[PDB]
Structures are given as structure tokens and as C-alpha cells.
Design a protein around this ligand. Structure first.
Ligand SMILES: C[N+](C)(C)CCOP(=O)(O)O
Ligand SMILES: C[N+](C)(C)CCOP(=O)(O)O
Lengths: 346, 348
């Protein structure tokens, strides 16, 4: 809803039935709040217009923030029934199936059955073969890419000049190399990750609101081959952040909402059997050795989540159209980065 | 056989995208050779050494396809990916901006002469029919045909040649008044009914594999695919009976105008296409089946004119921007020769 009637034309030419030759004035489009990278819109036929065929009365329009890998990835997942159906695809975005559901709330990530299912969902997604680069260059390649931008950017507002200067006073480039030493010496398999498994990217499916099999993972924009440790660590960090806050800065950070060791162990107890066929056949002692090594792994890679999304947020404070306290969020990520580095002593 | 000194790019792509033995392969133990047939893209076969054994799942040989010169880069990739997921094409192993790594399928391309074999011809038709009935996440408006012709023409009227013999050849082609002849062509096709379906757009013998140890065939290379008039896909395929791209001396193609399918052979093709595209078909009355076939005969032979015009222009564009060894200017004259020839046969 912004005088961009490209959404109407996209729907008219890409969708079958009633959508073909649907008059401009009879087109219903509204924004869907939530995402911090991409725009999302609902497109619908008027309730009175109801045609016979396979075609949907309601679709989604997603526009990319600021290419091929996300396109091809969405198609493949659509083809495997692992995501929504794909209706249209263009360089600027896509038209996808609207799925009756809602996004999870932050507080729901901690619920045992939810947590268990996300774990299993993530385990099976990690076991997929994808036509992408198998080298784990995403993690530090991305952080170097943002860091270069961060070190270039300047502001005009005195409040923001001060916020950026505090952030840079951590000597971010050295800090990045300390992280690189820590992480490159932490064993964690490269698997297809995714890199953003957040409440807002997990759908509670209506009807299936009973039984495992309640959820769907969506939004594979940041996906790539990566260290598994990152994918789980990033998820754990997401217990601390709630993006539904209504007032500025449009998020809340709660460090004491990070999962306990017992909560992490319950998650990885569902991850492992689903990721490794012969896990449940190991002895209790060998299982616990694996579990303890994994807790060290993911909590170290958790630091890369703070560092990466902290850097991302600073960059977004320049280039993003979305209203969100990006600077305040970057600082929140780095607060958590140093706090957690402290407790680990590494 | 042996690729150009930058076999190195091929090596680096294989090493990075392919799992198992490929990860630990040295540049000195990398096997690769060029495959010569295509006129858009370049193609290579890459292999592990025979002495090298796999660490399980991974392919021992793959195909590297590199895009040629001629938004559509997205559609091309998504299309290959979707077909691989459906088992309507080779598996996708790697995708990157300049091309892809794909399953090497044990097989060979068809020869020009094989297109007329009744069994080969029937299957091509059944195959094309089932592709035509697919739903794809692309634009459903038939803008491809004339959008593409207006595109190649805009460039054709802009290009200028350094060499003198190719200055004469272009001048001759331009003296047909192509901007005006395109509007002639547009008018004729506008009043020709033809179902909009997902079209392959380049169904030649070189994009059809005869599968080893053999339902004998597989349609491949969906680069030009889009929503388009059904008549063009079939019309284009009929034109392909006349053209042989395996000639080994200049201009590296042979045109035989006498090899266009007869009405008998055209009828045999569409008699296989139809029952595979229309659920009702074989139940229909004899009278009604003839009407549909006879209307289809007119439909496809009018759209065959778009095949000659479209590829004639394409071939001129390729004469300034393509790096493949081919007589692009000679090819363009042959297609426009065939266009007026066909325009006469139709009395249009
Ligand atoms: C929220 N985040 C900073 C972890 C990821 C980017 O936002 P989104 O694209 O997942 O909304
Ligand atoms: C052969 N053609 C001229 C009809 C189309 C372009 O060549 P190719 O891309 O199918 O090899």
C-alpha cells in the first residue's frame, strides 16, 4: 500500500483464473509487519469474486531488502513440500502460497514440545544436499563484508555518531580475529544451514495444532552451508530477543531468557537422534560425552550470532527502509557478546 | 578435447560444489574435455581419475554448462532446479552466476535425420505435450515471442561490422525491411488461435537425449523456455528437420529445405501430441478429430514463420557477440530464405 501497483500487475500476469484480467480497482493489498530484512504483503481477490479452479483467493508478495540462491532455494523447498508453494518469481521478489498459521512468539521457543520440534526440523534440514558451495565461507565472509561497511559509515545525528563511536571503541576488527581463532579451532560439521531460525521464521500451522508436526520453517534468505554450531547457537540467542515490541526501539533484549544448560540439553536431545541415525544406539556414557562437546560447540558459535547480527544491524541503520532501532539492537548484540564471552572465559 | 588454459575455473568449481573425492582432488588429477555441439552455451565433461575411488554418494563425472552471452538468469536456474526435483531433467549439483554443474546422463544427442523416424517423432510429441501441460512460476502472458524479436531487432539495427564481407551480408538482410516485416508477421499471428502453454522454445535434435539401455528420450536445455504460443514450439521443431549443426566445415551447418516434414509426417506427430495433451481426445468423433488436426496443421505452419524470423535475428546478434565457431551470418540468411519460402507456400 504505497502507490506501487506493480503488485497488481505481478499478480495479474503470474496467477491463473480470476487473477488474469482482474481490474486494478478490485485489487486488495496490505502490508505485514515483522521482518527486518524484507517487505511482505498480502494480496487477495474480493470476497465476492470466487472462481472455480486450483487457484488461490489469497497470496503473499515478498520483496528483497538490499537474487538466484534464495530463488532456487525457495523453489527446491517448495518442490519437496518443505515450504510454501511458489506461484511467481522475478528478480525483485516472489509470489508465494499463503499458509493458514501464525508466527511463534519469543516466549514459545522455550516450550518443551515446540523446542523439541524445532530441533528435529533443524536436524533434518541440516541433512539436505543443496547445489551450493560446500565450503563454510559464509560466516566470516559475511562478517568481513559487513565490517568493511561499518568501518566506512558515518552519521550526521549526534546521538548516532556517539552510538557508532561506542561500538567502534571495542576495536571490532581485532575482536573479529579473536573470534576467528576461537571458532576455527572448535569442531563443528559443515551442513546446509537455516541462518536465521527465529520465532518470526517459524509458523504454527493451524489444524496441525496438536500431535511434533505442528511447525514449518520458512524464510531461507540467509541460508548456506555453514558450521552447524552457528545454526543452533543463533537459535539459542533468539530466546533473548522479542521483535514485537510496539514502541521504540521495537525490540526487547532479555539476557536471562537464554536457555539453561538443561534447556539446551533437552533441545540437543531431540536434535541428535534426528541428525545422526546411530546416536540412540550409543551407550548413555558415549551419548553424554557427545552432548557435552556439543554444548561447548554451540555456545562458542553463539558468540558469532551476536557479532554477525550486531554488524548487520549497523549496516542496516544506513540502508534499511524498515522502522526498527538498528543501532540500539547492535549494542544489545554486543552487550550479550561480551557478557557471554566472560562466562565462557574464551 | 582439452579445454583452454583456464580448465582452472572448472577445477575450482568442481572442488567447491561437489562432495567426497572432489574435495581432496588436486588440479593435476583433474580430467576435463570440451563438448562441441551447442550454439549458445559452452559445455564440458569433468571427471575424477579412474584410479580415484569415491567416498560414497558423489558422481564420478559431471557436466559443466557455461552461459553464453544471451532476469532470465533467475528463470533459467529455477527452471533447471524444478525439473531436476521432478525428474524431468538431470540433477543439479552446482549453481553459480556463470553457469552450473549437472548430472552427466549416459546417452547421446539425436541426429538431424533421426527426427523423422516415426517412433522418435511420436515420443518427442508425447514429451512436448506433457511439458506443455505443466504449471510454472513464470509470467503467463505470451510476451516472449515478440518481446524477444523486438529485442534482437533493436540490437540488429544498432550493430556495425568491421569486416567487409559481413558488411555486405548484413546490408542484404536489412534490405528486407525487417521492422516492417515483423509487423506483417505480428498481424498474421494475431488472428491465429493458439493455446498459451509452457514452451521449451528450442526443441532441436541437440537438446534431445537418446538414453542408454533403452520412453527412449529426454528433453533437455530449457534456456529459452517460457510461456508462449503452442504453435511456435511445434512449428520450431518442424523447422529443425531442415537444419544440421554437425557439419564440420564452414559454415558448420547444412540447410536442406526438402527435409521439412510432409503433411503425412506432420499429421503423425500431432496424432501423438494430441491424445497426450487433451484428455478427451481419442474418445472424440472421427469428424471432430480431423477438424482439430487440420486446424492444428495451419496453426503450426504459420508459427513456423516466427521460428525463421526469431532465429534469423538471434543469429545476426550472435555474429557480433558470440565466441563459438559458427557461420552465424550464413545461418541468418538461410533462415530468412526459408521464411519467404514458407510465406509463399502458405499463400500469405
Ligand atoms: C532478526 N535478525 C537480526 C536475527 C535477523 C534479520 O531479521 P529477519 O530477516 O529474520 O527479520
Ligand atoms: C539452434 N538454434 C539456432 C535454433 C537455437 C540456438 O542454439 P542452441 O542454443 O539450441 O544450441
Amino acid at each position: 500500500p504505497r502507490t506501487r501497483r506493480r503488485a497488481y500487475l505481478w499478480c495479474k500476469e503470474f496467477l491463473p483464473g480470476a487473477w488474469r484480467g482482474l481490474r486494478e480497482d478490485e485489487f486488495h493489498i496490505s502490508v505485514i509487519r515483522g521482518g527486518l530484512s524484507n517487505m511482505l504483503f498480502q494480496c487477495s481477490l474480493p470476497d465476492t469474486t470466487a472462481t472455480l479452479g486450483d487457484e488461490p483467493r489469497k497470496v503473499l508478495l515478498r520483496l528483497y531488502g538490499a537474487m538466484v540462491l534464495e530463488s532456487v532455494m525457495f523453489a527446491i523447498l517448495a518442490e519437496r513440500s518443505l515450504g510454501p508453494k511458489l506461484y511467481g518469481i522475478f528478480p525483485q521478489g516472489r509470489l508465494e502460497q499463503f499458509i493458514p498459521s501464525r508466527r511463534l512468539d519469543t516466549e514459545e521457543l522455550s516450550l518443551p514440545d515446540i523446542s523439541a520440534e524445532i530441533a528435529e526440523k533443524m536436524a533434518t534440514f541440516h541433512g539436505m544436499k543443496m547445489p551450493f558451495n560446500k565450503e563454510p565461507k559464509w560466516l566470516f565472509g559475511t562478517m568481513e563484508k559487513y565490517l568493511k561497511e561499518v568501518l566506512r559509515i558515518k552519521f550526521t545525528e549526534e546521538s548516532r555518531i556517539k552510538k557508532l563511536h561506542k561500538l567502534l571503541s571495542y576495536n571490532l576488527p581485532l575482536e573479529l580475529e579473536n573470534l576467528r581463532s576461537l571458532l576455527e579451532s572448535t569442531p563443528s560439521p559443515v551442513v546446509f544451514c537455516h541462518n536465521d531460525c527465529q520465532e518470526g521464521n517459524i509458523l504454527l500451522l493451524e489444524g496441525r495444532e496438536n500431535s511434533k508436526q505442528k511447525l514449518m520453517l520458512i524464510d531461507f534468505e540467509y541460508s548456506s552451508y555453514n558450521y552447524r554450531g552457528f545454526d543452533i547457537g543463533n537459535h539459542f540467542c533468539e530466546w533473548m530477543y522479542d521483535y514485537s515490541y510496539e514502541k521504540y526501539p521495537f525490540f526487547r533484549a532479555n539476557i536471562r531468557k537464554y536457555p539453561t544448560k538443561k534447556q539446551q540439553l533437552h533441545f540437543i536431545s531431540s536434535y541428535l537422534p534426528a541428525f545422526q541415525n546411530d546416536f540412540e544406539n550409543l551407550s548413555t556414557e558415549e551419548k553424554s560425552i557427545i552432548k557435552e562437546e556439543m554444548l561447548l560447540e554451540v555456545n562458542r558459535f553463539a558468540l558469532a550470532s551476536h557479532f554477525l547480527w550486531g554488524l548487520w544491524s549497523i549496516v542496516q541503520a544506513k540502508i534499511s527502509s524498515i522502522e526498527f532501532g538498528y543501532m540500539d539492537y547492535a549494542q544489545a548484540r554486543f552487550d550479550a557478546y561480551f557478557h557471554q564471552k566472560r562466562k565462557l572465559g574464551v
